[PDB]
Design a protein around this nucleic acid. Structure first.
Lengths: 262, 30, 205, 100, 151
RNA sequence: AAACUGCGAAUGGCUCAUUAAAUCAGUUAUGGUUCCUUUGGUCGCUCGUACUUGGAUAACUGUGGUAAUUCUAGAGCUAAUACAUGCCGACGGGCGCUGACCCCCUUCGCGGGGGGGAUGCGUGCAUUUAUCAGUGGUGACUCUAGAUAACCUCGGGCCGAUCGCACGCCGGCGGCGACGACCCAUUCGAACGUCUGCCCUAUCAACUUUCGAUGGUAGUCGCCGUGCCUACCAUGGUGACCACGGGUGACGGGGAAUCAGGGUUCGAUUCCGGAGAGGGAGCCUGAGAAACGGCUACCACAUCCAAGGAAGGCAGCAGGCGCGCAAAUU
């Protein structure tokens, strides 16, 4: 009531931040940005909770105000800045680059990438419109407006943009057989090949996806993010390759790893 | 920048429309 | 103050409604802009989101359109003659949307003179005003007169439109909301719309 | 020139109120006899009428035309004039400076 | 069959009916262009909407309304309002304690365009959700199915 | 340091009084709206003093009034990121026009058709009244884009009148920033739609319609859809599948108290949503409040007074009194 809220209770925060309940009452309310509040990762969470480079939010503030953190090639001093899917985090002082990719359990993994792969990112386009004297435009999941896109790029396709120039380098059409990632829901974090799309006019479309090991799942069309042409990815996948293991195989692998390593 | 982007898009549009015309001609050939 | 909420209203079944909150700012209403005819007086009201509404209180000039010829000119508003909502909006002469007004015909008539190549029409009493017959007779080359003739070939004005043009007034409809935009614009009545509104005014009188 | 004053209760005289006594006005920003505490705030305050009568504690006067005699503590004393202009246009106007 | 039965002139706002004509090429009322659209979700525009003359600003086919949201159904029970009818929607509500159901109903006041003529009490009508058209009306009749007990 | 300016103060915290399709929950829609900020970010697309423009006013200095307040007056100075009403710069323009000159196809008889040219007119999606393509979209637009005719608000309307330590380039140019600002992008939202679901009561059976009750038409108002309000028109609309009325020691939900299975009770209470700030009502500012650690009244209490007047709102943290069976440290 009476205008926007500026706080976020720690228990009302997104569960994929893996925050604990005894640390405090509040969670870092992510600032407005290119990614939604519930499907982002605030810079403080990444720098403190994941990378353990800082112990408190003050140390995260010191790191960020030393202009050491670059998100998508731009220095970001906001510690609650919302970093999201496919966003590139480059820390030049320590010489490592990360790409925010969901792990198979629906959480943002600490996925280290080579500096060559840190120069671009994949963006799913959200709408294409024509404005201002017949100039086509393109809106991505990253809230980037790219003017003069290729006429073959339509909605639900993912483009590849160079971060330095912010211009489209390549694109993948949304079609069966193309590799994709699920960015929302129960199957969030899973990687597979698109097999079939069911269209429901006036409602949400359903896309069916099959893993490398043949597991088949489905999700709404808005949750589909095509990664590469065919079954090969255009980006580097996390330690797990998008395969979701059942709890039985997870336990079996954990027990085998415990046995082998002492 | 506006002028260069307009020129580059004009060239790309010419290529795209020419290939669309060629595809339509090939389709009507059959 | 003035409220536009629906929770002060009886339910569809007819039962009484008990409010769960007091009046909110976003449910407000404002007094009407009884836009009379007179020298232009427009007040600005700040609205939700910081935007601006133009509450016109007095207007005597509007941008009306002659649809058939596609000739829209800035014209003076003379009178209001029909309101489809309330008679008192004609008696007190308020400018609201979809109200029938009398507008000047001088700009449209002058553009028609710049169009004029028609044969003898209504030129009995004459005018004898010099430097005005240039726009009708003029000196012109052959191909210019050919173009004017080919324009005359497709010149056709309704008898009711002529009868209005003789009196210097035209029937028009306000297609804008003066109390919200500050502008009293519209289009000149033509065709069956003009016939219908003429019957309405005649039956009212 | 009668420039204002305060009545027996110290209430200042508002310029536009055409009365002999005191009135309560809903004052806002841009009015005299009121300084808003927060933006958009308006407060009702008691102010004295601008007409002079005997029920005044002080009446402020401004000398607009000098006479033939100097008051011992008002005219002979020369209170220094300090803090000259700061804007460049004012500087080149006061010292009567040209374009260059 | 006059259309202008109100104090204001009735016309489709999109269609311009004052275009200049030709005297030697006009004998009688030539044509009045009709504005109509096809609503989505596979609903076919009725013939009487395309070739009709009625003016209905709330008509899903010849008006300003857009159909979006719920597609429902019901049976016509009352037809005593101008361009508006009352339909009844029957359903069974599950009571978990007794593992059984109870009959319940809700009446919806829906807008009926003049493209649906001779709709009778008891017919099954398919309604589509639109913006609030009145205090209680939020649905527009999209298709009328004749009852099994009809002629 | 002060003071002007900007921003925040609409979050948070408290309480559960009101409130029984109301709130709320799941679902869906905004193609019916607004949106500070963040992030992309149309930002020489206007065709006849710019090497920097103007009233001011605080702080500061002095004179004061009042028993009294975070009351303020008079006088002397002085700034800007309250605010640009420039077109030296793309200045040759290009495009569409009330037309003084021009040349052609079998011919000296009015012949049907082609391009340049100026005093004289105009040139952007936020603002309303317009065709064929109907650029690109949607299941569906009266979408987006385009074109012509015009308009453009006393209370004007966007296209920049300013700061940052290094000393560097063939009367001039340059690199990083900061702050502004229209407008597009649902980032955060908010608002409005009732598809379904809520306790007891018939010793409540009919209810609603000078006063909108249900619908239609045209408007007003509103950010927008809408009886939201007005005028006219038609009598509708809701009920034993409990309408309407009454009661609740009723805020709703997540949820909590035994496990046979089924259920019965509870949920003021830390999370989500709603409401309120003694009770009503009305407002200013602002993107956002009908805000109360904002204002203006009345009602009920209540503080200081020199009796002229002035100042109030702990259901914030602590603390008091009161109420109590019942709850902590100024």
């Amino acid at each position: 009531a009476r205008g926007p809220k500026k706080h976020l209770k720690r228990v009302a925060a997104p569960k994929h931040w893996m925050l604990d309940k005894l640390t405090g009452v509040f969670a870092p309310r992510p600032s407005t940005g290119p990614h939604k509040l519930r499907e982002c990762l605030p810079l403080i969470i990444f720098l403190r909770n994941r990378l353990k480079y800082a112990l408190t939010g003050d140390e995260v503030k010191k790191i960020c105000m030393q202009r050491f953190i670059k998100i998508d090639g731009k220095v970001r001093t906001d510690i609650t800045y919302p970093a999201g899917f496919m966003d590139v985090i480059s820390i030049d002082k320590t010489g490592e680059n990360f790409r925010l990719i969901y792990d198979t359990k629906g959480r943002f993994a600490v996925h280290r990438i080579t500096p060559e792969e840190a120069k671009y990112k994949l963006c799913k386009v959200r709408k294409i419109f024509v404005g201002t004297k017949g100039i086509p435009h393109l809106v991505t999941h990253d809230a980037r407006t790219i003017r003069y896109p290729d006429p073959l790029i339509k909605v639900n396709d993912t483009i590849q943009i160079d971060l330095e120039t912010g211009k489209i380098t390549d694109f993948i059409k949304f079609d069966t057989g193309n590799l994709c990632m699920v960015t929302g829901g129960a199957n969030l974090g899973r990687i597979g090949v698109i097999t079939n799309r069911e269209r429901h006019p006036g409602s949400f479309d359903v896309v069916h996806v099959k893993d490398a090991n043949g597991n088949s799942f489905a999700t709404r069309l808005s949750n589909i993010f095509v990664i590469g042409k065919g079954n090969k990815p255009w980006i580097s996948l996390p330690r797990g390759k998008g395969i979701r293991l059942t709890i039985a195989e997870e336990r079996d692998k954990r027990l085998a790893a415990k046995q082998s390593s002492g | 920048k506006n002028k260069e982007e307009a020129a580059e898009y004009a060239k790309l549009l010419a290529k795209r429309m020419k290939e669309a015309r060629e595809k339509r001609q090939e389709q009507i050939a059959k | 103050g003035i409220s536009r909420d629906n929770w002060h209203k009886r339910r569809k079944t007819g039962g009484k409604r008990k409010p769960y909150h007091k009046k909110r700012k976003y449910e407000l209403g404002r007094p009407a802009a009884n836009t009379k005819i007179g020298p232009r007086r427009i007040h600005t009201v700040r609205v939700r989101g910081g935007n601006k509404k133009y509450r016109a209180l007095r207007l005597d000039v509007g941008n009306f359109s002659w649809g058939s010829e596609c000739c829209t000119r800035k014209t003076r508003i003379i009178d209001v003659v029909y309101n489809a909502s309330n008679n008192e909006l004609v008696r007190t002469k308020t400018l609201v949307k979809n109200c029938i007004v009398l507008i000047d015909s001088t700009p449209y008539r002058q553009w028609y003179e710049s169009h004029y190549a028609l044969p003898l029409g209504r030129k009995k009493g004459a005018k004898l005003t010099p430097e005005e017959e240039e726009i009708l007779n003029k000196k012109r080359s052959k191909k210019i007169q050919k173009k004017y003739d080919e324009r005359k070939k497709n010149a056709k004005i309704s008898s009711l439109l002529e009868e209005q043009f003789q009196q210097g007034k035209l029937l028009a409809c306000i297609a804008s909301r003066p109390g919200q935009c500050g502008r009293a614009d519209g289009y000149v009545l033509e065709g069956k719309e003009l016939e219908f509104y003429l019957r309405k005014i005649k039956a009212r009188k | 020139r009668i420039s204002g004053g305060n009545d027996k209760q110290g209430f200042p005289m508002k310029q536009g109120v055409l009365t002999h006594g005191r009135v309560r006005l809903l004052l806002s920003k841009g009015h005299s006899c009121y300084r808003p505490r927060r933006t958009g705030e308006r407060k009702r305050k008691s102010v004295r009428g601008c007409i002079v009568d005997a029920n005044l504690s002080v009446l402020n006067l401004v000398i607009v035309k000098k006479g033939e005699k100097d008051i011992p503590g008002l005219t002979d004393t020369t209170v220094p004039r300090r803090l000259g202009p700061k804007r460049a246009s004012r500087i080149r106007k006061l010292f009567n400076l040209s374009k260059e | 069959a006059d259309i202008q039965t109100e104090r204001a002139y009735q016309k489709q706002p999109t269609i311009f009916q004052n275009k200049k004509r030709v005297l030697l090429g006009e004998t009688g009322k030539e044509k009045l262009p009709r504005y109509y659209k096809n609503i989505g979700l596979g609903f076919k525009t009725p013939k009487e909407a395309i070739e009709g003359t009625y003016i209905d600003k709330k008509c899903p086919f010849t008006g300003n309304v857009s159909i979006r949201g719920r597609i429902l159904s019901g049976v016509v029970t009352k037809m005593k309002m101008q361009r508006t009818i009352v339909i009844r929607r029957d359903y069974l509500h599950y009571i978990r304690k007794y593992n059984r159901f109870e009959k319940r109903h809700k009446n919806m006041s829906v807008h009926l365009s003049p493209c649906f003529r001779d709709v009778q009490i008891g017919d099954i009508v398919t309604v589509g959700e639109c913006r609030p058209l009145s205090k209680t009306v939020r649905f527009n009749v999209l298709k009328v199915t004749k009852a099994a007990g009809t002629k």
